[PDB]
Design a binder for this molecule. Structure first.
Ligand code: KIZ
Ligand code: CA
Ligand code: NA
Ligand code: ZN
Length: 368
């Protein structure tokens, strides 16, 4: 049936600024929100403003030293922290900006608040588009991510769920999440991603986990230009098998939109419908589901993607004609919700997709 959806958003999020030229634009979350408000989707779901997660909350995963650094560092005291900045991988990809810590607190607060909601059985789905920062590590920033909201949310779910399944359709590998849970069977991580001279450089299919977590990390490496049909060929089958073999009681789905056609940093060729089919698939298992954001650098298409995927969560059909909104000019020249793929070559042959799939299936036969 139709699911109750709780959605997390702080309108201050759009005002954080990574700096001139930096492709990460928090503003995209405000565009997303404004677009789905203008489609009327607030009528169908509960909207919450998340708390700011505390340093205490964050050190459920991150080191005390790293979190102490994140809450002290500012543009005005950077010169005095040059050593700490290098150690914690801050100051370049992951710059120091005004309100950095508060940005992390809001990002993280959405993900944990959604997980609490799900644990209390007061929603079927929770949505935090400001979350999904899958590259942050225990004691270091990486790939524009500082605090790993996903890891903290899963730790919250593990309080009431013996097995949690994490699925990642961001074009990048979910390295920080895989790393955190690599040696436990209580979290299975499934990542689909570009692989081959590409950030972060991990997610080989031969990376399957270790110790009690061996066979609970699943990696589908892809080449440039995958399209809706190649992706669709393998996502439903892999997820069905994972569900069947792993039998999770809760699911976290990272929905990074840098896997869309025309993403400024991405090299895939998915449409918003192709992307969103993944949400559709996971929804059908009828499990407590936390949906998070992620990467995405062509921001009009990020707003489309996460608006449509909100509508998917709600089983609420919306028209292709975009309603008027505060960012209307960004959606030219067509002013429609859905996007076309490019004519870029798909380097992923059908044979390649089926072969990688069959290798993952052999691995999944190793579960209890
Ligand atoms: C470019 N790059 C590393 C990426 O896009 C990754 N997906 C990491 C990431 C960035 C922003 C975000 F909001 C969530 C995750
Ligand atoms: Ca991924
Ligand atoms: Na694991
Ligand atoms: Zn990404």
């Amino acid at each position: 049936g139709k699911k109750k959806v709780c959605y997390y958003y702080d309108g201050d999020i759009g005002n954080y600024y990574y700096g001139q030229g930096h492709p990460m634009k928090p503003h995209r979350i405000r565009m997303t929100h404004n677009l789905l408000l203008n489609y009327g989707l607030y009528r169908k779901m509960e909207i919450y403003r998340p708390h700011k997660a505390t340093a205490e909350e964050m050190t459920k995963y991150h080191s005390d030293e790293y979190i102490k650094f994140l809450r002290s560092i500012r543009p005005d005291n950077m010169s005095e922290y040059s050593k700490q900045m290098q150690r914690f991988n801050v100051g370049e990809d992951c710059p120091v900006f005004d309100g950095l810590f508060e940005f992390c607190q809001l990002s993280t607060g959405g993900s944990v608040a959604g997980a609490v909601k799900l644990n209390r059985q007061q929603t079927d789905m929770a949505v935090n588009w400001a979350g999904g920062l899958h590259h942050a590590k225990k004691s270091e920033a990486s790939g524009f991510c500082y605090v790993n909201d996903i890891v903290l949310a899963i730790l919250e779910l593990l309080k009431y769920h013996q097995r949690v399944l994490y699925i990642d359709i961001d074009i990048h590998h979910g390295d920080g999440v895989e790393e955190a849970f690599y040696t436990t069977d209580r979290v299975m991580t499934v990542s689909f991603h570009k692989y081959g001279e590409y950030f972060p450089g991990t997610g080989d299919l031969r990376d399957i986990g270790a110790g009690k977590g061996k066979y609970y990390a699943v990696n589908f490496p892809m080449r440039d230009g995958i399209d809706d049909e190649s992706y669709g060929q393998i996502f439903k089958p892999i997820i069905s098998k994972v569900m069947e073999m792993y039998q999770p009681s809760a699911v976290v789905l990272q929905c990074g939109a840098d896997s869309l056609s025309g993403d400024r940093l991405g090299c895939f060729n998915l449409t918003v419908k192709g992307h969103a089919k993944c949400v559709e698939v996971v929804k059908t298992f009828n499990l407590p589901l936390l949906m998070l954001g992620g990467g995405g650098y062509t921001i009009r298409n990020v707003a489309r993607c996460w608006t449509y995927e909100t509508a998917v969560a709600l089983d609420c059909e919306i028209p292709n004609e975009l309603p008027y909104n505060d960012y209307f000019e960004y959606f030219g020249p067509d002013f429609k919700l859905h996007i076309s793929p490019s004519n870029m070559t798909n380097q992923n042959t059908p044979e390649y997709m089926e072969k990688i799939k069959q290798r993952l299936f052999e691995n999944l036969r190793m579960l209890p």
